[PDB]
């Protein structure tokens, strides 16, 4: 879904005329783009089936471990340790220190381009931005009840798709593996 399509949808929802290029100097386009970017950044924070991976980081000469630039959130995977981002570097919350001793394992959530997002996610982002602009620029009229409804319908499909892709099952737990090993001799 090209950004121009989302911009035109927002303009049509706001009542103004459609455009042809996202570089047009109309002042509403900048606000639309900023709102779209902010909503996209906020939505993907939790993590989904297409923007979550595990990675390992290594320390520098001093002992400071940097973090990926495109990431949005960090989490630990080493026992009960806690990590957080501070001063453009990882912070060891469990020991109140900034210098590490070796590599660590952490979960990372990445931010992607608007084009690569699935259709369902793009619809949710577009319809959230449209309402955020319309309410702040024209007041709370009776037409927002359609934008909210469209957002909810899109969110249902998003959740269904995410549940379908992950393929959760009860056969992946270790007790089942132990039972199957026992049922062999």
């Amino acid at each position: 879904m090209e950004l121009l399509d989302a911009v035109n949808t927002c303009l049509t929802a706001l009542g103004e005329a459609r455009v042809t290029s996202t570089d047009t100097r109309h002042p509403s386009v900048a606000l639309i783009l900023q709102t779209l970017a902010t909503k996209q950044k906020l939505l993907l924070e939790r993590g989904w089936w297409f923007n979550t991976q595990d990675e390992e980081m290594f320390p520098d000469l001093l002992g400071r471990i940097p973090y990926p630039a495109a990431s949005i959130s960090v989490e630990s995977l080493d026992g009960y340790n806690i990590y957080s981002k501070r001063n453009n570097f990882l912070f060891n919350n469990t020991c109140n220190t900034m210098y590490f001793t070796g590599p660590v394992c952490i979960r990372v959530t990445y931010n992607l381009d608007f084009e690569d997002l699935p259709e369902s996610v793009a619809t949710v982002i577009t319809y959230r931005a449209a309402r955020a602009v319309y309410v702040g620029d024209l007041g709370n009229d009776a037409s927002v009840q359609d934008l909210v409804l469209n957002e909810q319908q899109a969110m249902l499909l998003v959740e269904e798709q995410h549940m379908r892709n992950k393929k959760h099952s009860t056969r992946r737990r270790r007790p089942w593996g132990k039972y199957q090993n026992a049922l062999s001799g």
Binding site: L156, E160, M163, R164, K167, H168, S169, T170, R171
Partner: protein, 56 residues
């Protein structure tokens, strides 16, 4: 003879994922209402119970 119809009815107007429910292996997790599908029911068991007593 009428009591031998085995059907499952998908309720209209309910959120369900019929394909996943009907094609996934046993043990999977699916998204949808846990009551969107029900077994066909015509109420013909009571009539059998009634007829048997009269015949007896």
């Amino acid at each position: 003879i009428e009591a031998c119809r085995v059907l499952h009815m998908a309720k209209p107007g309910s959120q369900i994922d019929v394909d996943s429910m009907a094609e996934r292996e046993s043990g999977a997790w699916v998204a949808g209402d846990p009551n969107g599908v029900a077994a066909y029911e015509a109420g013909d068991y009571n009539k059998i119970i009634a007829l048997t007593q009269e015949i007896q």
